[PDB]
């Protein structure tokens, strides 16, 4: 069935674009990280990772 989207209709019948972003948070090789910045790789010292 087709929609009757018209600007005359008020709230409840207007077209609303819905975007569903499905993510995968399990431990696996990821390539969609947030920008940020890469630092130096120190070793043999108690540091954050």
């Amino acid at each position: 069935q087709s929609y009757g989207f018209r600007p005359t209709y008020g709230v409840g019948h207007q077209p609303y674009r819905v975007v569903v972003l499905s993510f995968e948070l399990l431990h696996a090789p990821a390539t969609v990280c947030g920008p940020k910045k890469s630092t130096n790789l120190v070793k043999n010292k108690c540091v954050n990772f």
């Binding site: 399990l26 431990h27 696996a28 090789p29």
Partner: peptide, 18 residues
Amino acid sequence: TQSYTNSFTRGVYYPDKV
């Protein structure tokens, strides 16, 4: 054409990536 065999210890795979 068709035969019936049995897998003894095969058919296992890695479930996760850990």
